[PDB]
Design an enzyme around this catalytic site. Structure first.
Site, short mmCIF file in Angstrom:
data_model
loop_
_atom_site.label_atom_id
_atom_site.label_comp_id
_atom_site.label_asym_id
_atom_site.label_seq_id
_atom_site.Cartn_x
_atom_site.Cartn_y
_atom_site.Cartn_z
N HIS A 46 2.39 6.10 2.15
CA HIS A 46 1.44 7.14 1.79
C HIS A 46 1.98 8.55 2.05
CE1 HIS A 46 -0.04 7.73 6.05
NE2 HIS A 46 -0.32 8.92 5.57
N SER A 77 1.64 10.16 10.97
CA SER A 77 1.85 9.12 9.97
C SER A 77 3.32 8.92 9.63
CB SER A 77 1.07 9.46 8.70
OG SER A 77 -0.32 9.59 8.96
N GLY A 78 3.74 7.66 9.50
CA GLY A 78 5.11 7.35 9.15
C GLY A 78 6.03 7.23 10.36
N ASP A 121 1.58 -0.19 3.70
CA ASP A 121 1.88 1.22 3.92
C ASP A 121 3.26 1.37 4.54
OD1 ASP A 121 1.58 3.94 4.01
OD2 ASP A 121 0.31 3.97 5.80
#
Ligand SMILES: Nc1noc2ccc(-n3nc(C(F)(F)F)c4c3C(=O)N(c3ccc(-c5ccccc5CN5CC[C@@H](O)C5)cc3)CC4)cc12
Lengths: 52, 234
Positions: free
Chosen positions: B42, B185-186, B88
């Site tokens: 994402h 995120s990530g 994801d």
């Protein structure tokens, strides 16, 4: 007990072959002569916080 | 990161930061090897053209150990959807090799079975990133890390307003003010085993941050180990 007892005394990966403990290591490590410890081959082996 | 602490010198050497053309971090990543970054799918929508910065702890200053790396190949899991946020996960091949040093070094990829029964059954893991320090705050200029409890899977699904798939797990606290957040995120979720840190998760999503009754949602790395391995030969 094997892998379930204190990770079979392995430093890292543990699995059971023919009802016995086999240890192994992440890439960049070598299994020591005792077949349990994992020895880094370079200055920055994976998973180690950098100190030196 | 909400709560937790600053990663001290050398403490979080596998953290990467995806930066946009304005040179600002919008997502995290984990260093897997000299050519490969692990992040969330994402995050690939959060910018048009981005690069990867490693070795950074404090974005307000050039400390000297920082390096930016151009992305050569983006490898995005073709099952990812914003509708579900399932799958994801993405791997990035860099154009130039990362030189490992102080604050720059790969996290270990574990084996699946071992990781599942030995790493994810530990009390906690560690999440890190430059994301918001409060749900409404701005990005952190300092790299942070937070110890986060593994959350029972039943408790995890009950607490969620969205379907927690088998590719996801929960981590964090019921009420305490500690959690990941937007911008993390990530990034790395790692689990320690005898002083060696293995990648166990990817920061994915959450209903706000540190909220009562809500946990952080992480992509389960162990369910993609084969996929990661293949992406690293691509
Ligand atoms: N607690 C955490 N751990 O890691 C995290 C990484 C990011 C965030 N995050 N911060 C904020 C902010 F409140 F700051 F904006 C937001 C988020 C975040 O993901 N949203 C979010 C919530 C639900 C989904 C989601 C979950 C499952 C399936 C699909 C979706 C997407 N749909 C589109 C419509 C939307 O309603 C639902 C995706 C993102 C919230 C903002 C929290 C955490």
């Amino acid at each position: 007990k094997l892998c379930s007892l204190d990770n079979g005394d392995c430093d890292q990966f543990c699995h059971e072959e023919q009802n016995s403990v086999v240890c192994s290591c992440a890439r960049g490590y070598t299994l020591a002569d005792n077949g349990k410890a994992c020895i880094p081959t370079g200055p920055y082996p994976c998973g180690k916080q950098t100190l030196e | 990161i909400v709560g937790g602490q600053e990663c001290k010198d050398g403490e979080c050497p596998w953290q990467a930061l995806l930066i946009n053309e304005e040179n600002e971090g919008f997502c995290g990543g984990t260093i897997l090897s000299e050519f490969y970054i692990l992040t969330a799918a994402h995050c690939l929508y959060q910018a048009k053209r981005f690069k990867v910065r490693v070795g950074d702890r404090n974005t307000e200053q050039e400390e000297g150990g920082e390096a930016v790396h151009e992305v050569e190949v983006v490898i995005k899991h073709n099952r990812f959807t914003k509708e579900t946020y399932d799958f994801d996960i993405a791997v990035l091949r860099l154009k130039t090799p990362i030189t490992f040093r102080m604050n720059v070094a790969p996290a270990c990829l574990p084996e699946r079975d071992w990781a599942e029964s030995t790493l994810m059954t530990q009390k906690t893991g560690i999440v890190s990133g430059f994301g918001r320090t409060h749900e409404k705050g701005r990005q952190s200029t300092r790299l942070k890390m937070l110890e986060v409890p593994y959350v029972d899977r039943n408790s995890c699904k009950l607490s969620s307003s969205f379907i927690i798939t088998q590719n996801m797990f929960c981590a964090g606290y019921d009420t305490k003010q500690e959690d990941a957040c937007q911008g993390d995120s990530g990034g790395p979720h790692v689990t320690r085993f005898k002083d060696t840190y293995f990648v166990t998760g990817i920061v994915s999503w959450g209903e706000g941050c540190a909220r009562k009754g809500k946990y952080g949602i992480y992509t389960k790395v162990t369910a993609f180990l084969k996929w990661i391995d293949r992406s690293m030969k691509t």
